[PDB]
Amino acid sequence: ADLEDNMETLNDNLKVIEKADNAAQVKDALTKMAAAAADAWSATPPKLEDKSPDSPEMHDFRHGFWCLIGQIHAALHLANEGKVKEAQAAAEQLKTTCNACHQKYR
Amino acid sequence: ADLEDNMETLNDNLKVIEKADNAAQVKDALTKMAAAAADAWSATPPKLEDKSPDSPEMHDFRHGFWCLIGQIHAALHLANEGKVKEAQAAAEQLKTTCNACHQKYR
Amino acid sequence: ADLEDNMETLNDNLKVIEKADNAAQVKDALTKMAAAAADAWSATPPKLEDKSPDSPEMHDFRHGFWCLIGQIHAALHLANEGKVKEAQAAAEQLKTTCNACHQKYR
Amino acid sequence: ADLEDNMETLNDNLKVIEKADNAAQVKDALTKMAAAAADAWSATPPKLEDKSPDSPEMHDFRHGFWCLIGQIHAALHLANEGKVKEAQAAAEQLKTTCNACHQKYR
Amino acid sequence: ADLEDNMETLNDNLKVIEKADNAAQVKDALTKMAAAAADAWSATPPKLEDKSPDSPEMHDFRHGFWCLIGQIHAALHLANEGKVKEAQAAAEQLKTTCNACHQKYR
Amino acid sequence: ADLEDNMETLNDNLKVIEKADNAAQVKDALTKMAAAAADAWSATPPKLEDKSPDSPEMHDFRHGFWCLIGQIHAALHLANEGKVKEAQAAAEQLKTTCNACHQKYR
Amino acid sequence: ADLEDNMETLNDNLKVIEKADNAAQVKDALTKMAAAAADAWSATPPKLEDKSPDSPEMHDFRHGFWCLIGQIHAALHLANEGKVKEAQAAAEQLKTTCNACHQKYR
Amino acid sequence: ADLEDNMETLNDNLKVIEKADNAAQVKDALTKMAAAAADAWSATPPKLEDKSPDSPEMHDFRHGFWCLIGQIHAALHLANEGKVKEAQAAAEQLKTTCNACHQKYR
Amino acid sequence: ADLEDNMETLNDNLKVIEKADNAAQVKDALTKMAAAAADAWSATPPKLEDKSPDSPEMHDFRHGFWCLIGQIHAALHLANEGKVKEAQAAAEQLKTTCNACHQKYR
Amino acid sequence: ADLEDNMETLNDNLKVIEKADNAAQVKDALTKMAAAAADAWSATPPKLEDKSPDSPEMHDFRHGFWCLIGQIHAALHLANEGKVKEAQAAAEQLKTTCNACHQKYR
Amino acid sequence: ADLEDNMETLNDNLKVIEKADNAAQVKDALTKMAAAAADAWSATPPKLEDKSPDSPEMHDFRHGFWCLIGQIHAALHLANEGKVKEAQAAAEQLKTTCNACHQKYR
Amino acid sequence: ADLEDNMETLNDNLKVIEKADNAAQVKDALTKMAAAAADAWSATPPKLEDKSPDSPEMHDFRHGFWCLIGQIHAALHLANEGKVKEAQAAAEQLKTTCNACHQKYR
Ligand code: HEM
Ligand code: HEM
Ligand code: HEM
Ligand code: HEM
Ligand code: HEM
Ligand code: HEM
Ligand code: HEM
Ligand code: HEM
Ligand code: HEM
Ligand code: HEM
Ligand code: HEM
Ligand code: HEM
Ligand SMILES: [Zn+2]
Ligand SMILES: [Zn+2]
Ligand SMILES: [Zn+2]
Ligand SMILES: [Zn+2]
Ligand SMILES: [Zn+2]
Ligand SMILES: [Zn+2]
Ligand SMILES: [Zn+2]
Ligand SMILES: [Zn+2]
Ligand SMILES: [Zn+2]
Ligand SMILES: [Zn+2]
Ligand SMILES: [Zn+2]
Ligand SMILES: [Zn+2]
Ligand SMILES: [Zn+2]
Ligand SMILES: [Zn+2]
Ligand SMILES: [Zn+2]
Ligand SMILES: [Zn+2]
Ligand SMILES: [Zn+2]
Ligand SMILES: [Zn+2]
Ligand SMILES: [Zn+2]
Ligand SMILES: [Zn+2]
Ligand SMILES: [Zn+2]
Ligand SMILES: [Zn+2]
Ligand SMILES: [Zn+2]
Ligand SMILES: [Zn+2]
Ligand SMILES: [Zn+2]
Ligand SMILES: [Zn+2]
Ligand SMILES: [Zn+2]
Ligand SMILES: [Zn+2]
Ligand SMILES: [Zn+2]
Ligand SMILES: [Zn+2]
């Protein structure tokens, strides 16, 4: 999938978690998010197509996905323990990271 | 995934198919559509909530999904054979199936 | 398994569902129902032996089982989400299909 | 495989079953036939490209494959149980369905 | 599955073996029985909750299942070798063990 | 893993069970216990090093592990059915098995 | 495999172990011994045919094999750790079980 | 396994096939023989260590195994088809190849 | 499959290759050819029945199939690289082997 | 597993390596450590429950596990080469990292 | 494999991509590179054998492989979309990273 | 992988074998050699491009690879048995096979 598609996936599954009333539904959504973010991690966005792999921007872009994957895994861990509310709140904290990266690079 | 979720997967992948520049992306999209449709197959839409599983409406709902799965498997056959423009055209024609069910039941 | 055997599987596992107090028990019983139903789909019931595979009675018989597999997956979806009383509710609805087919063909 | 290819699989394995003198030969041949019919179900024959996918013709065409698959599974079931002559006799009855569909859409 | 459920599996498959006319039917039925007995071995019957897990009663109760499993494997071994009447005769001898345990702890 | 190692796994997981707030943690713990006990089953404790594999002491050592595996499979059945308090209570009662072997052979 | 066949497997592989100069050879021979022993466990030896499956002779026979599988795993544990002379040593000890059972029942 | 070991597998399973009274016994025995011959093909017998790997002797030696494997597959094919007496007769013809090679290089 | 069946597989799939316009179709047909050829390798053709498995005619027959499997893999290698016209070219070359063997033995 | 449990796992397996006399035992222990550290990597310790995912502390916490995983993989690599002493010394170097993180965050 | 070998692998597959005329060949080569780099990531080169795991050099060494793996995954993504030229150009950009690390540490 | 590529794999792994200090490295190397040789088996070298697949030269080319695969499987047998010096010596003797084909066809 390409970057735009990984984002759609990230976005839609954020909304699935927000409306979810059960752990499995949260778990499924976080699994999809984890896969979408790992794919995206190696992507180069349009605004950075002229930048070299070792630029500060790239670094920063790759760091933001590694940060996102960390958090998804943490919420996924809570989801697996049946802790819906806590998983949802962890998901909600994720938005901070989506937005920070969007400000710089979207 | 619920009915809305499956519908979102179907529509999202339709767009991926439409903008694709290669077979793998098309095959991937249709593979996800097949999965979503197979799941949606056994669902009850809001407007048929009061109907019996053995009703004309529910027979009709379920046959729409069987029809769609059929057309997706056909399109997937083409993507697999690397036939992008053709898989794309088959996707466009599936939309008649999407629309027909919607008109009756959305 | 023969027709009688499959019926005995559908019937026991439906009792299992009826008295379960947990998702795993419902998940597992519904899975055994799907296989029994998928087997029975191809059978020829005593009362319809004098009949051709293209008769309206055999279309009816065969399609009784599609509708059953439909409702089984619906209930399995709810079971997978930990929703015991809702999977039980949806398992209750299967009986309308069991009853309709028995009325005409048992 | 295209329609023609599945048909060759179908015909070719019908003959294998006719000359077969052991259960295994019949099992494999009926297993190849099942997969060829399954794939074939999603196809559109030349005589029906002009037709809409909802049309009476397409419904009747695809029903023809699910009825063949039904009979194939029954035959297979018999062969799993080692009953070679009975699987062969049920394979002969399959010809009805072959010829019915050929008479209409071939 | 609880104790009662395994027993239903045990009894239900005993009957299948009695009316069976082919090796495969016997194989599967004896395979289901093995798994039901295996699961059953760890259970505590109502008549023995008062008892300590080391007690003579529990030892004799659990030994009853390993002896049944033994006979089940012997029967199965015969069925793998296609000897249908001999598997059926060994299945009849199983009744000894069924009734011995029922006489003491059921 | 050696005997000490297996014993450490058993004790550690006992504590995890005791402090758990969810089924997945309990199921996981017992799954590890089952593995450790299955391994320890075939070991020779320090104080029986001079005894024969066919001795009353070694019969007795090995039957303790068979008994424990039995109780763990029972408890695991409960954790699987999401029954936390009950799986916890079954775990506490296993301790009688731990103690009895220890008194004789540690 | 029948009783004679399984015995021939136990005997050859024990020679293999005896003359191996490497873990892999011992690992592999012990694995083949476990399966042969797991098969033989359900057999009825010529000398105990006139006997009921619940006799003390058949409890004895059956339990001869539990003890064998026990000692086999002990030696497999050492083999898995690359400890050739220690796995060979532990394989030497199996013979006490072979000998005891042969004394009473061969 | 060394050459001697494969030979023991070969010989040992030849006898199993001679006394076999069911297809399964023959299948497994011929399957073990195939793997033993396959492994054996790469070995160098004592009588030929002095020889170059291109020599007439090594070519003829290794050809002897591919010819045995050929006959083994033919026998196996017959056994898969349940024809027990015919598999046994083809196994008897295998002796030709056994003895031809033994006469030259054993 | 018997010799006739395998030949029918080689022949149909070679036509499939000849008229494919895509790698997947060629990949899949060549895979079915390898299995048919691997089966036929052990057969005995009518004309060589009066012959011993060590005759020059049977060495010739058997080695016809090694050479075929050789050329099949060559073409599968090109197919796997998406090279349709080159896999087709290499599939054309197989026929020299088909022809040579038919000249001497069909 | 939660953080406290991953640590127990880390700790116990450190002691297994220290007393290990064979590569397999070291390998098993490092595999368990690798899994415990990857789980822990996404955890938030008690002392940092008020800190945001992008705090310097979190960063630092995640960096310490990535450093630990690096080292475990390096020792695991040595263990796989049969280099016990070297693996043990690599394990011992690990303690530097455990302790550094404990000073700040435990 | 050790560091020197991972490098050979990296080097050879760089040359395979440079001469490749098809996506599969590129894909295969990048898969081999990805695996070689992940192995290498945990290695310690000769020039840094005296340095502690947390030295700036080690950090820097591990960062260079993580950067390389990122890029390989990006080229692998393009290769999977059938984009040969683009994959090759991404591979060529990789050399910047190989060389930078070689200047410091080789 | 093409012929050159396979040859590079063969030579590279030969060197790994020659400099190895442990079994796992040797086993790994030979495993890669086996794969490369199995692939090269079905290739046509530059200097035989104008020859038929049924030519003495192509028979001869292919038999060289069968011979090499044979010797590699023998050497691999030794590495598996942890026999480093011996696997090394078997590798050195394979070089005669490499050279003989080269002299004729490189
Ligand atoms: C779960 C968190 C995230 C969500 C919900 C999210 C959502 C989205 C959405 C809806 C879009 C618009 C896609 C489109 O239709 O074109 C987008 C685009 C984008 N996002 Fe994210 N995003 C997330 C995380 C991130 C992160 C962590 C980064 C960088 C580290 C990032 C970088 C970008 C970029 C560069 C685009 C523009 C892509 C293009 O123009 O091709 N996103 N995101
Ligand atoms: C590729 C074909 C299809 C596409 C792209 C598609 C797309 C959509 C979309 C975008 C929605 C909006 C739902 C929401 O998020 O609120 C929707 C809803 C819906 N669709 Fe589809 N659909 C397709 C096929 C079908 C078929 C075949 C059926 C009937 C058998 C169907 C039945 C419905 C129904 C009943 C709703 C209402 C959902 C609700 O309000 O809960 N769709 N669809
Ligand atoms: C989940 C729903 C169902 C349940 C619980 C159920 C249960 C049963 C039971 C307990 C029997 C008696 C078995 C015996 O002969 O000893 C039976 C018989 C039978 N059922 Fe069902 N059934 C179900 C669905 C169906 C459906 C959907 C059909 C038709 C499409 C059907 C057709 C029949 C027929 C033809 C028999 C008599 C066969 C004979 O004489 O052996 N059943 N069923
Ligand atoms: C097992 C039973 C069947 C057999 C043995 C069989 C056999 C065949 C054969 C030998 C052909 C000629 C293929 C060729 O032109 O190379 C064919 C074509 C065809 N068959 Fe069947 N068939 C069977 C079942 C069916 C069924 C059930 C249907 C419809 C539901 C069907 C529809 C067709 C169609 C539409 C063609 C024409 C394809 C074309 O012209 O491209 N067949 N079949
Ligand atoms: C294959 C032989 C066996 C058969 C056919 C069989 C069958 C049955 C049946 C039909 C029931 C009534 C279940 C119900 O109340 O719904 C039952 C209950 C029971 N059986 Fe068996 N059984 C067998 C072997 C055994 C063995 C070997 C033991 C003990 C070692 C055993 C112990 C029990 C117990 C304790 C109950 C009572 C469970 C309860 O009341 O909840 N059974 N069995
Ligand atoms: C869940 C139940 C059990 C728990 C929690 C448990 C726990 C322990 C613990 C913490 C140790 C200390 C060993 C050390 O690290 O030095 C130990 C040792 C030991 N346990 Fe257990 N155990 C259990 C079950 C059993 C059973 C069923 C047996 C006998 C069949 C057994 C036999 C022994 C023996 C012989 C030792 C001495 C080990 C040595 O000194 O080498 N344990 N156990
Ligand atoms: C690893 C240990 C064992 C070895 C090496 C071994 C070996 C053998 C051998 C070589 C034979 C002669 C086979 C023939 O009839 O041609 C034999 C027979 C026999 N063994 Fe074992 N055995 C072992 C364990 C056991 C055990 C544990 C038992 C009982 C629990 C047992 C019971 C028997 C019986 C009953 C026979 C005679 C069966 C007949 O007449 O066909 N063996 N054994
Ligand atoms: C299925 C047919 C065969 C049977 C039943 C068979 C059986 C045997 C037996 C029982 C031995 C004595 C093993 C020992 O010393 O412990 C042996 C040794 C041997 N066999 Fe075979 N064999 C067969 C096929 C072959 C073939 C086809 C070849 C050559 C192509 C061959 C070559 C040898 C060699 C070279 C030895 C001597 C090994 C040594 O001394 O270390 N055998 N075989
Ligand atoms: C890919 C290449 C090949 C193709 C396309 C092919 C095709 C065929 C066909 C269509 C038949 C007639 C089937 C029938 O009896 O109804 C046949 C027969 C036969 N072929 Fe092949 N073949 C091939 C390779 C070979 C090879 C390599 C050999 C020998 C090494 C061989 C030996 C035979 C024999 C002996 C028969 C007659 C068997 C009988 O009477 O039933 N074929 N072949
Ligand atoms: C192999 C290296 C390590 C070992 C052997 C080890 C061992 C331990 C042990 C025994 C505990 C006490 C657990 C308890 O009973 O509550 C602990 C706790 C802890 N460790 Fe580690 N540890 C290691 C690595 C690390 C690393 C790398 C970090 C941070 C990057 C870390 C952070 C912590 C924290 C935050 C706690 C307190 C957890 C709590 O209170 O819930 N540890 N460790
Ligand atoms: C795809 C990119 C790379 C290529 C093509 C490549 C190629 C090579 C080659 C051919 C060698 C000589 C190996 C020998 O025969 O001894 C080598 C060595 C080396 N490379 Fe790389 N390399 C790459 C990436 C890297 C990276 C990213 C690093 C560090 C982050 C690195 C660090 C080293 C080191 C330290 C050595 C010396 C190893 C020793 O002496 O044992 N290389 N590389
Ligand atoms: C372990 C044994 C072998 C090794 C180490 C080896 C090594 C090599 C090497 C390093 C090359 C240089 C190719 C290049 O990159 O341009 C080569 C080429 C070649 N080898 Fe081998 N080889 C071995 C076995 C064989 C065998 C058994 C054959 C024949 C059946 C063979 C046939 C060839 C041919 C024909 C070439 C020329 C490739 C070309 O110019 O395209 N090799 N080999
Ligand atoms: Zn992607
Ligand atoms: Zn960087
Ligand atoms: Zn910038
Ligand atoms: Zn769903
Ligand atoms: Zn969307
Ligand atoms: Zn209906
Ligand atoms: Zn059935
Ligand atoms: Zn009909
Ligand atoms: Zn197809
Ligand atoms: Zn046509
Ligand atoms: Zn055909
Ligand atoms: Zn329709
Ligand atoms: Zn259960
Ligand atoms: Zn009750
Ligand atoms: Zn029942
Ligand atoms: Zn006890
Ligand atoms: Zn262990
Ligand atoms: Zn511990
Ligand atoms: Zn004993
Ligand atoms: Zn057996
Ligand atoms: Zn008893
Ligand atoms: Zn071997
Ligand atoms: Zn000797
Ligand atoms: Zn033997
Ligand atoms: Zn040669
Ligand atoms: Zn065949
Ligand atoms: Zn010959
Ligand atoms: Zn965890
Ligand atoms: Zn950060
Ligand atoms: Zn702080």
Ligand SMILES: [Zn+2]
């Ligand atoms: Zn490595």
Ligand SMILES: [Zn+2]
């Ligand atoms: Zn650091």
Ligand SMILES: [Zn+2]
């Ligand atoms: Zn420095």
Ligand SMILES: [Zn+2]
């Ligand atoms: Zn290749």
Ligand SMILES: [Zn+2]
């Ligand atoms: Zn190289």
Ligand SMILES: [Zn+2]
């Ligand atoms: Zn030739």
